[PDB]
Amino acid sequence: AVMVLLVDDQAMIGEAVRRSLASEAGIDFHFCSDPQQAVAVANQIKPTVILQDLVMPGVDGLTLLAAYRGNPATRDIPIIVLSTKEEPTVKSAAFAAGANDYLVKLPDAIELVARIRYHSRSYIALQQRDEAYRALRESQQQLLETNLVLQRLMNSDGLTGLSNRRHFDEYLEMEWRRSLREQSQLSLLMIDVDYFKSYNDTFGHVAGDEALRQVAGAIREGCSRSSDLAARYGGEEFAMVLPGTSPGGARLLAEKVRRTVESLQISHDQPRPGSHLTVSIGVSTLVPGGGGQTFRVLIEMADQALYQAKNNGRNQVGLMEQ
Amino acid sequence: APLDGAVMVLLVDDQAMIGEAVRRSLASEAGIDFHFCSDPQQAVAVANQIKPTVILQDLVMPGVDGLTLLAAYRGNPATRDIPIIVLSTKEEPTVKSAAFAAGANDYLVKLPDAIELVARIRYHSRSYIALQQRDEAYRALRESQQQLLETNLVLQRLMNSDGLTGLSNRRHFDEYLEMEWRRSLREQSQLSLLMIDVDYFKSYNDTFGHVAGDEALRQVAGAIREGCSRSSDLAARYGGEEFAMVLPGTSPGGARLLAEKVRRTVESLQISHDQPRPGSHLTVSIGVSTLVPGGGGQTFRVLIEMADQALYQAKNNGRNQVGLMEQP
Ligand SMILES: Nc1nc2c(ncn2[C@@H]2O[C@@H]3COP(=O)(O)O[C@H]4[C@@H](O)[C@H](n5cnc6c(=O)[nH]c(N)nc65)O[C@@H]4COP(=O)(O)O[C@H]3[C@H]2O)c(=O)[nH]1
Ligand SMILES: Nc1nc2c(ncn2[C@@H]2O[C@@H]3COP(=O)(O)O[C@H]4[C@@H](O)[C@H](n5cnc6c(=O)[nH]c(N)nc65)O[C@@H]4COP(=O)(O)O[C@H]3[C@H]2O)c(=O)[nH]1
Ligand SMILES: Nc1nc2c(ncn2[C@@H]2O[C@@H]3COP(=O)(O)O[C@H]4[C@@H](O)[C@H](n5cnc6c(=O)[nH]c(N)nc65)O[C@@H]4COP(=O)(O)O[C@H]3[C@H]2O)c(=O)[nH]1
Ligand SMILES: Nc1nc2c(ncn2[C@@H]2O[C@@H]3COP(=O)(O)O[C@H]4[C@@H](O)[C@H](n5cnc6c(=O)[nH]c(N)nc65)O[C@@H]4COP(=O)(O)O[C@H]3[C@H]2O)c(=O)[nH]1
Ligand SMILES: [Mg+2]
Ligand SMILES: [Mg+2]
């Protein structure tokens, strides 16, 4: 994994290093005698550590240190400056210049390979750390979005974006079971857009669906409690469950849903020439009692209320308690 | 786990003076905490509790061998990877070689000036921090990647594979066929298609049950997948008892040749059936069509049409036979 790039004008020092990194596998070596090519050599072999001689003819090791730190290609490679006359004034200045280590020309072979490996691993760990951090951010972003999408396809109505039929009915069933234990009121609204069939085959589908999308927008705005839930049972049929809600409160939301839906003023000629889209709403409510009683009985009640509503003129609200 | 720049230095020296001199250089930098320990006996325990990013260890201490204490750091799991800068008194360049072998990562002659000190303190801590973060990222990465692979595998079976036969399902086949069609328009090559239906299958399913019907299907499927062996060939279960086979760069002669291998090898499976009369076997009606896409309004759909027609005519001319699309 290691690749040592040594820079020094002394052809012998370059050898004392080569002959110590020899009996050491996993660590490539490279020797450069001409400082004028050092920067070049560095942008090619891509070392994991650079041993840079401080004093050479024509260029000092610190102006080369500024070169290695000039391009991304090598700006992160750790460098060990090698000195001859150990002058703690230049030493101090080397570190200030960013030098990562300082060695009085060639120490014990055991130490020289220990520093070479420690720096290389550090260099690679930083490389792999950022790389990982980046790939990780992508992965989690991907996974989060993928799950959002699958969730939506799983429990939501495509057009309306509201919950689908089975998601809703399963919630209704679990809410019924909990209202049975807590002996509380469970209200349900069955919402049908009036004369929608008539409307659909006279304005097309894109107009029908566009209207159903709008009505759905007035339906979710009707309930706001975290435990409240609205659905598009299918076609122009919607549903809303309101845990812990009383007949009166349920009635309020129904009426509020009806009113806001009408204030959309979606033109339609069936109720007669100059009217607009409206909805009939059946409202039911109960406190689950023991014995038989399934949530299906609450639904039968809402449907009856819905039927009564339609047969009394539509665009109004029907209630039922038993 | 440790956040970026969270430097924690642990100095283990017996001389409280050396401690104080450092316990200052590191007060002018809040982005780095400090902790001094004078008892070698607790050095490891202390490091285990404060969790340092770098430790400065005194090589010579009373009643404790220095090079052995280092080895003790490499033996504790939580400190094994912590960089150690050994502090030498008055110098000794012999202990030095031994120190690095023992696990030392850096060598300092008792307290250099705050500049070289912190450079090394931060260089080593950053290094330790990086390694710790790399492994936490690598771990969370494989976890995330696995979750995605698992999901992708589920979607593949659902989207382009048929559970029972293990063959390609219909949308995958249709998609592939369309691509082959377009490629054939470009290369002006012949594209053949076979539509394969098991004869009297329903009849067989209500008489022998799903268990047996499914196994019959699994068998036909196998005889079909063997009728074509080119890397670009593709066999698919097209429906209930309906299958399909698309053969790129195949002439009408080749297509009907392979059509017959199927009919033949299916009938030789000899899956007893009481239809169309006692003592029968499950046979296959096949429809073959082949075309060279010719430009203008004509898609891969026409190729499917033609094979369906040949299959209709084959089913109506007695079954257990090959029907060939008539050319005007
Ligand atoms: N006008 C009106 N608006 C309603 C009603 N029910 C729900 N909302 C709307 O829905 C938001 C969230 O309701 P939540 O999920 O029950 O979450 C609620 C609930 O858990 C709690 N909370 C607030 N007010 C009451 C209260 O009077 N009784 C109870 N039991 N909890 C309350 O605080 C949360 C947030 O409250 P908000 O900030 O007000 O935000 C409320 C409010 O804007 C209602 O009966 N009348
Ligand atoms: N399931 C459900 N039912 C709804 C919602 N909004 C209204 N209701 C029903 O309508 C009744 C009166 O609502 P309100 O006029 O807004 O008058 C409300 C409101 O002024 C206040 N209130 C209760 N909960 C909240 C809340 O979460 N946020 C705020 N801001 N006010 C609340 O208390 C009054 C009476 O509350 P309740 O006794 O609960 O009786 C409520 C409830 O049965 C809703 O989003 N979900
Ligand atoms: N143009 C051309 N290419 C040739 C010919 N013979 C071999 N190849 C190439 O060699 C691959 C492997 O050939 P294989 O070992 O005979 O193994 C073959 C062979 O066992 C079988 N196969 C495919 N087509 C025919 C055929 O027309 N007759 C027979 N008897 N076997 C076939 O499928 C295997 C893999 O088929 P491929 O995926 O297409 O992959 C083929 C194909 O790319 C040839 O006469 N003409
Ligand atoms: N798509 C597809 N078509 C098939 C396959 N097996 C047979 N055919 C069709 O049947 C024709 C004659 O096949 P053959 O009797 O094996 O006679 C073959 C065979 O002896 C030899 N040949 C061609 N390709 C291969 C190959 O990949 N492997 C071997 N072993 N022989 C090959 O060339 C003869 C004529 O080849 P073609 O001109 O291509 O004409 C072929 C081809 O149109 C198959 O696995 N996939
Ligand atoms: Mg020199
Ligand atoms: Mg001491």
Author numbering:
A (entry chain A): 18 to 339
B (entry chain B): 13 to 340
Task: Reproduce passages from the article.
WspR (PA3702 in Pseudomonas aeruginosa), often described as an ortholog of PleD, is a conserved response regulator of a chemosensory signaling system controlling biofilm formation and other adaptive phenotypic changes in Pseudomonas and related species. The N-terminal CheY-homology phospho-receiver domain is connected via a helical stalk to the GGDEF domain with diguanylate cyclase activity. Diguanylate cyclases of the GGDEF family catalyze the cyclization of two guanosine triphosphate (GTP) molecules to one c-di-GMP molecule, and have been shown to be homologous to adenylate cyclases. By switching from an active to a product-inhibited dimer via a tetrameric assembly, WspR utilizes a novel mechanism for modulation of its activity through oligomerization.
We determined the crystal structure of full-length WspR from P. aeruginosa containing a CheY-homology and GGDEF domain at 2.4 Å resolution. The asymmetric unit contains two molecules with similar conformation that only differ by a 16° rigid body rotation with respect to the relative orientation of the GGDEF domain and the N-terminal regulatory unit. In the crystal lattice, WspR forms a tetramer by an antiparallel packing of two WspR dimers (“S” or “SYM” in the diagrams indicates crystal symmetry–related molecules). In these dimers representing the asymmetric unit, the CheY-homology domains adopt a conformation reminiscent of an active phospho-receiver dimer observed in OmpR/PhoB-type response regulators. Due to the lack of posttranslational modifications, and considering the coordination geometry, extra density near the conserved aspartates at the active site of the CheY domains was interpreted as Mg2+ ions. The C-terminal helices of the CheY-homology domains, referred to as stalks, were clearly resolved in the electron density maps after molecular replacement, and extend to long coiled-coil–like structures that connect to the GGDEF domains. In addition, the electron density maps clearly revealed binding of an intercalated c-di-GMP dimer to a conserved inhibitory site (I-site). Cyclic di-GMP at the I-site is bound to two conserved arginine residues, R242 and R198, the latter being contributed by a symmetry-related GGDEF domain. The WspR crystal structure exists in a tetrameric assembly, with helical stalks from a C2-symmetry mate physically blocking the active sites of the diguanylate cyclase domains by being splayed apart. WspR is trapped in the crystal in a distinct inactive state that suggests a novel mechanism of feedback inhibition and activation.
